[PDB]
């Protein structure tokens, strides 16, 4: 829900990490029109642990949204943005005609029509070299046989559905700094039940202990390497772990 995105040739891909990702607030920002999730599942993302999640923003045509998919080419798919076969990321798209369509036409969004070759996947090039097409040399000047490589969209509100701005956000997953929102529960009283304090899995009765843990430890072991004490990482309080009856 930013103010102004970039064009389709640029990425502006802001890497997000070092924090827990909650994949539930994106559904309360704007009504999306395309929620493809190549590689993963929309519901099954708050459980895996990833190392680096990238996120780019761009505006592309509505007729060509189906062309942004792994193993599929197009007009803007060989020179500006390519999805390889090892690309497993959700492609979220939503129309933005109410914010990126002025009556006099906007020419701020640019796209490339043809390069000298096909660009490699997972690569971004912002070269403004004027295209050299013909049998006569072009000395970096706009002439007859010399063409600019960048072309504008020209989005207008009078154009029908399909030629409108579509802000498509490519969320990627790469492979542990970003994890899912592990939800907690309520601490029960002294009863032999199951417990899991950040990996500490076992059975026993959680009773009020009298120990004094130093402010850098969580759990503790006995003389025989047996976990019988732990501190709840919710509110500072010691808890004894006696074996079940």
């Amino acid at each position, epitope marked *: 829900n930013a103010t102004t995105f970039a064009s389709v040739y640029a990425w502006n891909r802001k890497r997000i990490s070092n924090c827990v990702a909650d994949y539930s607030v994106i*559904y309360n920002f704007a*009504p*999306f*029109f*395309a*929620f*493809k*999730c190549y590689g993963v*599942s*929309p*519901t099954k993302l708050n459980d895996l642990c990833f190392t680096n999640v990238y996120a780019d923003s761009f505006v592309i045509r*509505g*007729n060509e*949204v*189906s062309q942004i*998919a792994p193993g599929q080419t197009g007009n803007i798919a060989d020179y500006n943005y390519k999805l390889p076969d090892d690309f497993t990321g959700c492609v979220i*798209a939503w129309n933005s005609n109410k914010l990126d369509s002025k009556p006099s036409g906007n020419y701020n969004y640019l796209y490339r029509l043809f390069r000298k070759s096909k660009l490699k996947p997972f690569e971004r090039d912002i070269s403004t070299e004027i295209y050299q097409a013909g049998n006569k040399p072009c000395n970096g000047v706009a002439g007859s046989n010399c063409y600019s490589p960048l072309q504008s969209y020209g989005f207008r509100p009078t154009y*029908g*559905v*399909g030629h409108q701005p579509y802000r498509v956000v490519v969320l990627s997953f790469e492979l542990a700094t970003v994890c899912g929102p592990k939800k907690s529960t309520n601490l029960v009283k002294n009863k032999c039940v199951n417990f899991n304090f950040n990996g500490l899995t076992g059975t026993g009765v959680l009773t009020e202990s009298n120990k004094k843990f130093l402010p850098f430890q969580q759990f503790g072991r006995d003389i025989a390497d047996t976990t019988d004490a732990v501190r709840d990482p919710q509110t500072l309080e010691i808890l004894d772990i006696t074996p079940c009856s």
Partner: single-chain antibody, 235 residues
């Protein structure tokens, strides 16, 4: 394939739920669309995108997509809420799969006109056209849903707004020809080699999205419908 119970019940004044489950490729990944068809009329879209409703449908209807199952909550059902509710989804095989239908029994402008019927000639040929004018046919897409007398909805085909990708059902795959005419503002569906086992109406539905259902998996929905033509295919 989707499991849906045949009929539910409810009293006027209480809220009931209509459940419709689906595999992890149609509800767990795509959206659920609810429809309601009164006896003797055309269906209409009630809840789309699992969280939105059109201006025609009031806020009395509730919907929620939790995991791989769907639920249709009708808060405060009235005496006019006696119809059949069907589910909608898109499987990985590029198909518009339906549910089973819930016969809710209580205990208390845009015009899509289509013609073409009569002698079906099961084994010859038949022409079916659907008129369209007044809703920017060049932008909005269409649909093709037939309904047998006494049965549920059957998906036929669908075309994007640009006249490109179309998907065929397994029962008629590779035999029809769906195409549109942007100059005349009309929709056609040529049927050939039809058997005596496809007695339906082929309701001409209007889509609210633009592209095929595989890319725009969060905007598709049949808002405006029409009066289908009952065929008389027999021996």
């Amino acid at each position: 394939v989707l499991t849906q119970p045949p009929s539910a019940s409810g009293t006027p004044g209480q809220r009931v739920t209509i459940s419709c489950s689906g595999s992890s490729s149609n509800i767990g990944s795509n959206t659920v669309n609810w429809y309601q068809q009164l006896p003797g009329t055309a269906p209409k879209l009630l809840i789309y995108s699992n969280n939105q409703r059109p201006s025609g449908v009031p806020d009395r209807f509730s919907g929620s997509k939790s995991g791989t199952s769907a639920s249709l909550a009708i808060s405060g059902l009235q005496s006019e809420d006696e119809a059949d509710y069907y589910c909608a989804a898109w499987d990985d095989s590029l198909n518009w799969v339906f549910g089973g239908g819930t016969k809710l029994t209580v205990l208390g402008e845009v015009q899509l006109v289509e013609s073409g019927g009569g002698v079906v000639q099961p084994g010859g040929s038949l022409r079916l056209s659907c008129a369209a004018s007044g809703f920017r046919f060049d932008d909005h897409a269409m649909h093709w849903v037939r309904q047998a007398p006494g049965k549920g909805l059957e998906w036929v085909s669908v075309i994007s707004g640009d006249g490109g990708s179309t998907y065929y059902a397994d029962s008629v795959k590779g035999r029809f020809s769906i195409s549109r005419d942007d100059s005349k503002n009309s929709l056609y569906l040529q049927m050939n080699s039809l058997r005596t086992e496809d007695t339906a109406l082929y309701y001409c539905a209007k889509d609210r999205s633009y592209g095929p259902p595989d890319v725009f998996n969060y905007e598709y929905g049949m808002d405006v419908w029409g009066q289908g033509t009952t065929v008389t295919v027999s021996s």
